[PDB]
Design a protein around this nucleic acid. Structure first.
Ligand SMILES: *C[C@@](*)(O)[C@H](CCCNC(N)=[NH2+])NC(=O)[C@@H]1CCCN1C(=O)[C@H](N)Cc1ccccc1
Ligand SMILES: [K+]
Ligand code: NA
Lengths: 251, 27
DNA sequence: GGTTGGTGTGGTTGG
């Protein structure tokens, strides 16, 4: 996260760290959507151009965290994965279309003040929140700047959703209905972006109708980080919800 | 269930430091 | 240190 600030304790209790078993390293963010399911970006798990192809036994998740690298005794919880599901139409060859994956935990996690699931939007929530100029919030432990670095605790920044024609005009990469973009315009006089290492983490919005946090997006891609005239791209959760529901129903 | 309602914020009637900025953006 | 920094009559938590 670029130009954000340190999270408060328990501010993002659905935030999940995806961690490679060996060598031990932070891969990506992710989010907790029930006691057994964790949502992330598909490219965190599968991206052949960078020789990445992780399965369940390569990985673990860490839930409840605030410090990036310290093991937070008696707070954080660590889960093995029973299974990984990548969207079958995830397009890594071109533009990361459908950059979404589900990970099923081997055992349900026990909730706490630090560990609690986010809501997924229904059709009505998505229609009313996902509008140009409304702000949501991104969180992560990724880079503080483009590299050409690492925070010591979870970072947060709030960013406005951007009009689709402005998103489309900002890049040559083909934008689809499975994506949206967020970030200030050059002249807007605020800054901030997600960055490398933030993929998989949630773009959330707080409903003014019921006071609940909804995950509208997943950090997916960008060109550089926090550049003027560029914006962060996010997987559109509601658009892929039939697939999320299909996998949780069937498995 | 109580998805989306944070134990240390909405459940205690406490606001975090920047959520008002999100609420204001809807105005 | 440790599945872990830099300091705790801990802390988002013991000894
Ligand atoms: C894997 C994630 O951490 C990372 C998030 C980047 C978010 N950036 C900004 N400014 N908000 N995603 C990536 O690094 C993705 C994975 C593959 C390369 N990539 C990119 O963002 C490239 N910089 C652009 C791109 C290349 C190929 C296909 C689509 C986008
Ligand atoms: K200690
Ligand atoms: Na920008």
């Amino acid at each position: 996260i670029v130009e954000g600030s340190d999270a408060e304790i328990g501010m993002s209790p659905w935030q999940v760290m995806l961690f490679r078993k060996s060598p031990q390293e932070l891969l990506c963010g992710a989010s907790l959507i029930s006691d057994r399911w964790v949502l992330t970006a598909a490219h965190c798990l599968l991206y052949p151009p960078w020789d990445k192809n992780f399965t369940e036994n390569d990985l673990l998740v860490r839930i409840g965290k605030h410090s990036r690298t310290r093991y937070e005794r008696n707070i954080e919880k660590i889960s093995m994965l029973e299974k990984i599901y990548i969207h079958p139409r995830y397009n890594w060859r071109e533009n990361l279309d459908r950059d979404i994956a589900l990970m099923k935990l081997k055992k349900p996690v026990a909730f706490s003040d630090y560990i609690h699931p986010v809501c997924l939007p229904d059709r009505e929530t998505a229609a009313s929140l996902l509008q140009a100029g409304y702000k949501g919030r991104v969180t992560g432990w990724g880079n503080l700047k483009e590299t050409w670095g690492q925070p010591s605790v979870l970072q947060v920044v709030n960013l406005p959703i951007v009009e689709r024609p402005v998103c489309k005009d900002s890049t040559r990469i083909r934008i689809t209905d499975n994506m949206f973009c967020a970030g200030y315009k050059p002249d807007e006089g605020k800054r901030g972006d997600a960055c490398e290492g933030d993929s998989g983490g949630p773009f959330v919005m707080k409903s003014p109708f019921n006071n609940r946090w909804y995950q509208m997006g997943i950090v997916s891609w960008g060109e550089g980080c926090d550049r003027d005239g560029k914006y962060g791209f996010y997987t559109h959760v509601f658009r892929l919800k039939k697939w999320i529901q299909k996998v949780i129903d069937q498995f | 269930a109580d998805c989306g309602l944070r134990p240390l914020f909405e459940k205690k009637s406490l606001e975090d430091k920047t959520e008002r900025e999100l609420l204001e953006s809807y105005i």
